[PDB]
Design a protein around this nucleic acid. Structure first.
Ligand SMILES: [Mg+2]
Ligand SMILES: [Mg+2]
Ligand SMILES: [Mg+2]
Ligand SMILES: [Mg+2]
Ligand SMILES: [Mg+2]
Ligand SMILES: [Mg+2]
Ligand SMILES: [Mg+2]
Ligand SMILES: [Mg+2]
Ligand SMILES: [Mg+2]
Ligand SMILES: [Mg+2]
Ligand SMILES: [Mg+2]
Ligand SMILES: [Mg+2]
Ligand SMILES: [Mg+2]
Ligand SMILES: [Mg+2]
Ligand SMILES: [Mg+2]
Ligand SMILES: [Mg+2]
Ligand SMILES: [Mg+2]
Ligand SMILES: [Mg+2]
Ligand SMILES: [Mg+2]
Ligand SMILES: [Mg+2]
Ligand SMILES: [Mg+2]
Ligand SMILES: [Mg+2]
Ligand SMILES: [Mg+2]
Ligand SMILES: [Mg+2]
Ligand SMILES: [Mg+2]
Ligand SMILES: [Mg+2]
Ligand SMILES: [Mg+2]
Ligand SMILES: [Mg+2]
Ligand SMILES: [Mg+2]
Ligand SMILES: [Mg+2]
Lengths: 47, 14, 117, 103, 110, 56, 142, 150
RNA sequence: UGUAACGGGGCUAAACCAUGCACCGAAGCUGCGGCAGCGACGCUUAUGCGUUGUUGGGUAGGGGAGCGUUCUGUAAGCCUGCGAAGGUGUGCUGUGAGGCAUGCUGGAGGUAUCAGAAGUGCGAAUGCUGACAUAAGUAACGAUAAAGCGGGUGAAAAGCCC
RNA sequence: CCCGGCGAGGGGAGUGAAAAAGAACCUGAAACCGUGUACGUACAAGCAGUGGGAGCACGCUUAGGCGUGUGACUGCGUACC
């Protein structure tokens, strides 16, 4: 039946969402620290 | 308000 | 899929405004203020769940000192007398007796002096 | 008339025929329960302040009901440090009905 | 019984109309009418006209006997305030509020 | 020359505690016309202390 | 349970005459403050005035060891810019003897509504007679 | 968004916040921050994976006794009445019919039976196979299915 | 600015030295109850546990597990004018996001379950828009050419008409 | 039909399932402004709560007090990003 299906345990990691609270972990600078070039939108040095 | 009056000059604390 | 966060935000706000009922003014009418109130209310409750045991034990100690001093011996000496007489009645029940059953507390003081001497 | 006995690491100055709310006692829903740890008996003028655990004194209770208390919301919070945590708690209890303080 | 009379969108501020309405509250309609007659407020004119209206409604639709009447409930609610504009010095434009109110009087046969 | 924090409904009502109106204590009743008027004021007809001094 | 709390509607307060001839100011004052706050009663409740009305007699004969009689200064500031007025213990006894005992016990009492309500129960008198013979105050020794 | 690039006010002086375009995402009637596009949600399936899943779901239909395999299954003339009568004698409600060769007679008969989908063994697909309760399959259809899955 | 270099009262011990015994004292440690992580051994399973031990402050940050919203399949099914969504309270419940039942309003939609997608969660950005408070019934009512009276009109006249 | 300025607005009546569906018109939230009611408050000092907590008011058996509102007095307590 089309509603008795499910993937395997471990297939879908289910993403990672930034800036959506505190208890979510990464909110408010979403895992990219405080001030600095790496914290800027489009920030990050060339290879 | 499309006109935005300029601020009066600040005291010259040089 | 666009989501209109009307109903869920309204619920999230009323959930705080219900716990902030009873506070003064904007602290019970406004969300931006009821929030800090609810949070500091929680902080104070968490700290007072320990300060309550402290307050109550010191109240019991004060009442036991008062009754002991009526019966002629100090609180420190009296607790030492109970410790030596191996009695295990804690301060809560001790002070409750002190308030209600005076004569049984006199008997307690008697046992304590008998164990101190 | 009362007796002083501990149940949950804490004592009670309970009189006969009343109800106490002790810590959760792993007894059945309504079965009987006794407490051999009587610390003191009142009985009027003759107050029998037993030394630890009154020798012959034992209490007979009656397990009324098992339930949980009204919720208590723990709220840890730290200002300016981007940290807050909340969690509820409903301590379990146990109602006992003191049947008789057997001296 | 309780006969109602409303002046909705009353061209005056509730802050003033209720200031005057706090006079005739629980007062028998006769002395209320007289207090309002000799009270020197535009809001007094307004609440007096509304009270006359309440009395007429009571003694035409809901019975009679002005004498056995009291002004139990009287309240003044804010109404839709008209947003005008008032040009002040130096090109700065205010917002003068042509306020209004919702007067409501309830006369009771007690 | 301007507030640091906005006042509240409490303080506002407390200021207005005095701005309430005061009804005229008791109207008089003219000796002749038996009608009501302000004390030391001619009636709505013109009678003053029982003397029709207007009739206009 | 819920541990006992006094009830001001029900607490019984008694009256105590206390002579203060030669007694040490501070020790007399501490005993008075104890008995006013009601810490001598097994029903002592911190948020309830459970004390005893206490009358103090011969307040002008309390004593102070050391050189405190002519050195224990009392400072009080009126509010004006210069107004910092001082007065030694000797001068205080000369002018308002009762104020010495009232000051000591007020300082030793709590603060706030209940502290002031407990201070009220004090009836310091400079003399030896007190008109409160109506209340049968039991002689106290502290 | 239909607009212009005029800074709605200066960078300084005013009491208003910074702003540099009325088409900012923040503003009312502004421009969506990450505005969606017409994308393609097509996924890839390894031919072996497709065949394996379909063999597995046929095995599961066989095991759950939902594959009603029969010989030739047909109606004589295009009448949905006749077809529903056939499925009413065959004790069926929600069926996927799969014939090795489809005739427009039966196709037009099953065109208007929303609980009945007639197909050809070349056009089977797992969503239909699972969404339909009873999958009726002609014998030639089964042979085609065999020689195609294998 | 005022005591203003015991925290205050105040103390000649309620100070300093030595000795001693009690007591108070923290979210420490112990007790009872509860949750969870990790480990170690056994039945057997990623487990209930026999259990045992131990751990559980936490920002940046890394890891794991979830709740909730809208939309697609499930679903021409299911709940619903015997009252849907929303609104508004109440009770109950979960560790938490939350959930359930239901009173009143509401008067036509909502939707299990398990999967799928994301415009998926706001308190801040001198955030944008709308509404609405504050100061406040406060300043002011815009030239210091200047009004008074009688009459008329009128629901009403300082301002209109004579 | 009645008050009102042969007003505005309103109260009746009537239509309508429903007129707090009356055109400022489905639903009608929050801010904000009010009326009534219960309690508190005019010798008391500060992030306005939290722990305790009397008294008052109100609802339920049976007294056991409990549940709701308030909250005198008291201990701690200098908002958030
Ligand atoms: Mg990083
Ligand atoms: Mg930053
Ligand atoms: Mg840095
Ligand atoms: Mg960095
Ligand atoms: Mg939508
Ligand atoms: Mg409210
Ligand atoms: Mg402790
Ligand atoms: Mg504006
Ligand atoms: Mg005023
Ligand atoms: Mg203090
Ligand atoms: Mg340009
Ligand atoms: Mg747009
Ligand atoms: Mg291909
Ligand atoms: Mg444990
Ligand atoms: Mg292991
Ligand atoms: Mg730890
Ligand atoms: Mg941790
Ligand atoms: Mg982190
Ligand atoms: Mg968003
Ligand atoms: Mg923030
Ligand atoms: Mg002013
Ligand atoms: Mg002025
Ligand atoms: Mg002028
Ligand atoms: Mg003029
Ligand atoms: Mg409407
Ligand atoms: Mg409709
Ligand atoms: Mg509202
Ligand atoms: Mg005073
Ligand atoms: Mg008072
Ligand atoms: Mg203070």
């Amino acid at each position: 039946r089309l509603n008795t299906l499910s993937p395997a345990e471990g297939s879908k990691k289910a993403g990672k969402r930034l800036g959506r609270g505190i208890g979510s972990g990464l909110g408010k600078t979403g895992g990219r620290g405080h001030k600095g070039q790496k914290s800027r939108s489009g920030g990050g040095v060339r290879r | 308000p499309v006109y935005i009056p300029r601020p009066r000059p600040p005291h010259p604390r040089l | 899929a666009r989501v209109k966060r009307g109903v869920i935000a309204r619920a999230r706000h009323k959930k705080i405004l219900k716990q902030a009922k009873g506070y003064y003014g904007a602290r019970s009418r406004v969300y931006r203020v009821a929030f800090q109130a609810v949070i500091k209310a929680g902080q104070y409750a968490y700290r007072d769940r320990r300060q309550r045991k402290r307050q109550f034990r010191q109240l019991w100690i004060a009442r036991i000192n008062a009754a002991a001093r009526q019966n002629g011996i100090s609180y420190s000496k009296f607790i030492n007398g109970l410790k030596k007489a191996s009695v295990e009645i804690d301060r809560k029940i001790l002070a409750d007796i002190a308030v209600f059953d005076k004569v049984a507390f006199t008997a307690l003081v008697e046992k304590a002096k008998a164990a101190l001497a | 008339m009362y007796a002083v006995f501990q149940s949950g690491g804490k004592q009670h100055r309970v009189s006969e025929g009343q109800t106490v709310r002790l810590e959760k006692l792993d007894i059945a829903t309504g079965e009987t329960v006794e407490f051999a740890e009587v610390l003191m008996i009142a009985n009027g003028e003759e107050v029998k302040i037993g030394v630890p655990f009154v020798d012959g004194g034992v209490i007979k209770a009656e397990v009324v009901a098992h339930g949980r208390g009204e919720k208590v919301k723990i709220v840890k919070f730290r200002r300016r440090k981007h940290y807050r945590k909340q969690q509820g708690h409903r301590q379990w209890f146990t109602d006992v009905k003191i049947t008789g303080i057997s001296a | 019984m309780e006969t109602i009379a409303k002046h909705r969108h009353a061209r005056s501020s509730a802050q003033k109309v209720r200031l005057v309405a706090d006079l005739i509250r629980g007062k028998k309609v006769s002395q209320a009418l007289d207090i309002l007659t000799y009270t020197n407020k535009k809001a007094a004119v307004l609440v007096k006209k509304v009270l006359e209206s309440a009395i007429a409604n009571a003694e035409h639709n809901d019975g009679a006997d002005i004498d056995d009447l009291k002004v139990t409930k009287i309240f003044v609610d804010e109404g839709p305030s008209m947003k005008r504009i008032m040009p002040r010095a130096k090109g700065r434009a205010d917002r003068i509020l042509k306020r209004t109110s919702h007067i409501t009087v309830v006369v009771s046969d007690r | 020359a301007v507030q640091q924090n906005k006042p509240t409904r409490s303080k506002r009502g407390m200021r207005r505690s005095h701005d309430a109106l005061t009804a005229v204590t008791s109207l008089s009743v003219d000796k002749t016309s038996g009608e009501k008027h302000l004390r030391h004021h001619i009636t709505a007809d013109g009678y003053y202390r029982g003397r029709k001094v207007i009739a206009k | 349970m819920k541990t006992f709390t006094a009830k001001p509607e029900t607490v019984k307060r008694d009256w105590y005459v206390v002579d203060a001839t030669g007694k040490t100011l501070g020790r007399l004052a501490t005993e008075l403050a104890r008995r006013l706050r009601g810490k001598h009663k097994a029903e002592y409740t911190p948020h309830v005035d459970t004390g005893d009305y206490i009358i103090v007699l011969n307040a002008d004969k309390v004593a102070v060891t050391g050189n405190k009689r002519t050195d224990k200064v009392y400072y009080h500031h009126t509010g004006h810019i210069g107004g910092i007025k001082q007065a030694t213990f000797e001068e205080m006894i000369a002018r308002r003897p009762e104020r010495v005992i009232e000051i000591a016990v007020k300082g030793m009492l709590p603060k706030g509504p209940l502290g002031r309500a407990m201070f009220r129960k004090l009836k310091v008198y400079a003399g030896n007679e007190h008109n409160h013979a109506a209340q049968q105050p039991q002689v106290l020794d502290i | 968004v239909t607009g212009s690039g005029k800074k709605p006010w200066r960078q300084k002086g005013t009491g208003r916040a910074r702003s540099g375009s009325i088409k900012s995402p923040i503003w009312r009637s502004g421009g969506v921050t990450f505005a969606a596009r017409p994308q393609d949600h097509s996924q890839k399936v390894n031919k072996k994976m497709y065949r394996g899943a379909l063999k597995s779901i046929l095995s599961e239909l066989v095991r759950q006794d939902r594959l009603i395999v029969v010989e030739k299954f047909s109606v004589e003339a295009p009448k949905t009445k006749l077809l529903a009568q056939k499925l009413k004698d065959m004790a069926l409600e929600d069926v996927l019919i799969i014939t090795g060769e489809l005739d427009e007679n039966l196709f037009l008969a099953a065109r208007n039976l929303h609980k009945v989908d007639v197909r050809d063994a070349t056009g089977i697909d797992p969503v239909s196979l699972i969404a339909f309760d009873k999958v009726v399959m002609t014998a030639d259809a089964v042979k085609q299915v065999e020689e195609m899955l294998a």
